[PDB]
């Protein structure tokens, strides 16, 4: 439900962070059209007086000197009186945007970064778990940035999240294991972080620096800061950080195969600036983890299919040895249930239902048997909470919280149905998820919740979720019984 | 093993390359036990005068100054009158081995390597092929190293190889597409390159520097140089390099899930030395490429399986519909042959064989059947050159160069046999593959071939290979035939 939270235009807030300067230029004279109000502390003159002036009248030589590789490459290091700065160039709203922030100061940064890239490639990671892969990614991002807490955050299908892994200094509270509402990161934020994979919040208590003028005159709204490294973030999120007791924040999008899988989120208790070059070095790490997860995930999935296929094949064999449907199905009980990781299975071969392992009563199966016919599924149907869809069996969570059903005939209702019991799960939410925000009276002013202490909830009446291999295995069993 | 080529103990040749110095110390007094004969060029005095001295009294002060971190990290930079050097430690034959080698002179090396690691780890790699991956891998190694010609070299199953990709500077001889005898890299070299994944030959024309004494006194043979970065290589190979017109060579092992998959092989026309840290940066790229390849390959196999499972799912639906068996093995003719990418199929389900598509005559199929029933196979059998093993069909490469057979019953002869035609292939070898070496009369001194000019051969009478997904699909078909 697109509430207040999803409707704040976080690319049109018109402010930048105080540690950098932003200038925007228009046209072939490159006339200054927008400038951050703090620009005097790097240009020498009041920002108000530079609007409408050509880039050659406005920038210092050291910068202009490096315009071509800047335009070609996006960023260059320039040494100005105030010190070493990184200059970043992009295009937005038909303007050339130039940002300046302090440059990396450690000469051996790239050398350290190459070493941790090795830890994260290595012969084989994931060796004792994809778990171990996440922990190393957290550990190495924490090594390269120096943040007090680094966490790997995975989105669930409903866009709520949980901290799978976490590397942090001794003496820091943690969030390992906890789940967070989907509204902690609303729709338009997720969309932006799909496009802009990096964001640094250098000081969560600093006031944002405004742009001048406050609109782009051509457009009647603020400059689009979607791709600004200096963009100041939603004030609601600043409040969220300060309620966590967080003084600086850095997060990196984990894009797996083009989709937003999760984040690596970093917290620091005191303000902290990370250089652009160091941020891009961390981003190489996150692209690395994303690749290691894909290769391991696909290996896991091929090994699972292998196991299922061996079962179908041993089944196949058994049938070729004595015309004995019920006979062999009863003899190969483990295999038929193992096919899909099930605890029971009804085989509707026409006459009576044949019930193997742990199932609902004969009456009750016929009841969902009849109900299954009038359903809009083609050849297979599956659910991990039968009760939420067919309450005649809502009380049988003990044997049928989940079913996987394949249709063995066109017209007619001949099926094999696998059953799963519920599996109770205790999840710990970081604060009470029924009160994920605090709106003011009148529900125009929204605020973050004030507490992130564990709030425990137990999930009932849902099975283990049917995996792609379960489905494939069911399709193959259907091919063999036709 | 076979040739004299496999016999040469290449880790026991007792020589190092002239750009570095090797020292080996024994026991608690760190007494110098083995030293390269050029050691004076770095330590002022006659090496022979140094055997038996404690490390503290042989090594220059500058190296000693760094002793603690060297043994710790195993590598360190030291500034000596002669220039900056990388000091490397490892253990061999119970000695501590110290190697000295000119250090990297460009301070921006690591920044550069991080840039090329981006190009290769980036989102959307291979997104115009694994071919594009290899091309990118060669291009990035060539840029990082400066070598004239960089090639990606893949081992076939018989351990001969072919250049799959190549990045070289304008107007340079190439080898793209050519095949090289397995003996070009004999067995003990392949073994050594699986555990020591980097090798540099700085000057293909230089004489090796001997070690003193020529044996380890305790062992009566020379110091094991398996792990030496300075190891001078087999003389037959140096002769092979010079016959190629190559003055410097550097290659890296490509390990993919533990096995030796290929090499990245670089040639320079003149001598050239890459620093150790620059070679370790290149090693990061090859580990990257191997990761990229596993993920792309396991994705390709998943997509293949899904296409086959879709075919089986459509066959399953044509069954349980109208008619007999031969009455759906008839429109699904197309599907039945597509299961395994085949041009024909014979079905022995009881009566006479049922022949679908491009098959050999019924009498020939009957005789093949009779023959297959006596071979030693459980469920499936396959070959891509039927003729070598069953010469009654050696003449029929037009329809039956390859076969794939599943048993549809136990002690019975019920089969499904899929057929492929031959696919002619034009291999171009780098020189005459019938003369891969030139021995001297008496067969005690071998030399490499003199020529690498293209040498054509056409492989006849072999089908396209039966891949994993064909085999899985066949097993799937057998499960539906019961
Ligand atoms: C009413 C709307 C709400 C809201 C808005 C909001 N949050 C934003 C950014 C953001 N949230 C998170 C959440 C987390 N940070 C953590 O460490 C954890 C758990 C470990 C979670 C769940 C993150 C990581 C970010 C990114 C910024 C950062 O610190 O890394 C934004 C976008 C901010 C922007 O302008 O870019 C918005 C609009 N948060 C709420 O809780 C409610 C009230
Ligand atoms: C009778 C033995 C023979 C022999 C021995 C041999 N070769 C060795 C190393 C080596 N060979 C190759 C081959 C290639 N180089 C290329 O560029 C291509 C293709 C374009 C090929 C096929 C390589 C790459 C290497 C590794 C060293 C390198 O140059 O990168 C060795 C081991 C050398 C060592 O001591 O490490 C041996 C013993 N080669 C023959 O041709 C026959 C005569």
Numbering used by the authors:
A (entry chain B), B (entry chain A): 9 to 490
Task: Copy text from the publication.
To assess the impact of both temperature and X-ray dose on the two structures of SaBphP2 and complement our earlier studies on the related SaBphP1 PCM, we also determined the ambient temperature structure of wild-type SaBphP2 PCM, essentially free of radiation damage as a result of using an X-ray free electron laser (XFEL). To gain a detailed understanding of the function of the S. aurantiaca phytochromes, we examined the crystal structures of SaBphP2 PCM at cryo and room temperatures. The wild-type protein crystallized in the dark in the Pr state in space group P21. Crystals grown from the PCM constructs diffracted to 1.65 Å resolution at 100 K and 2.1 Å at 293 K. Our spectra suggest that time-resolved serial femtosecond crystallography experiments are feasible with various pump-probe time delays with SaBphP2 crystals spanning from the ultrafast to slower time scales. In this study, the SaBphP2 wild-type microcrystals diffracted to 2.1 Å at SACLA in nuclear grade grease [supplementary material Fig. 1(b)]. In the SaBphP2 PCM crystals, subunits A and B form a noncrystallographic dimer.
Phytochromes (PHYs) are red-light sensing enzymatic switches first discovered in plants, with homologs in the photosynthetic and nonphotosynthetic bacteria. PHYs are composed of a photosensory core module (PCM) and an effector, enzymatic domain. However, both proteins bind the same bilin chromophore and share a large amino acid sequence identity (38%).5,14,18 Biliverdin (BV) is an open-chain tetrapyrrole that is highly conjugated and allows for reversible photoconversion in BphPs between the red light absorbing (Pr, λmax 700 nm) and far-red light absorbing (Pfr, λmax 750 nm) states. Here, we report three crystal structures of the SaBphP2 photosensory core module (PCM), lacking the effector histidine kinase domain.
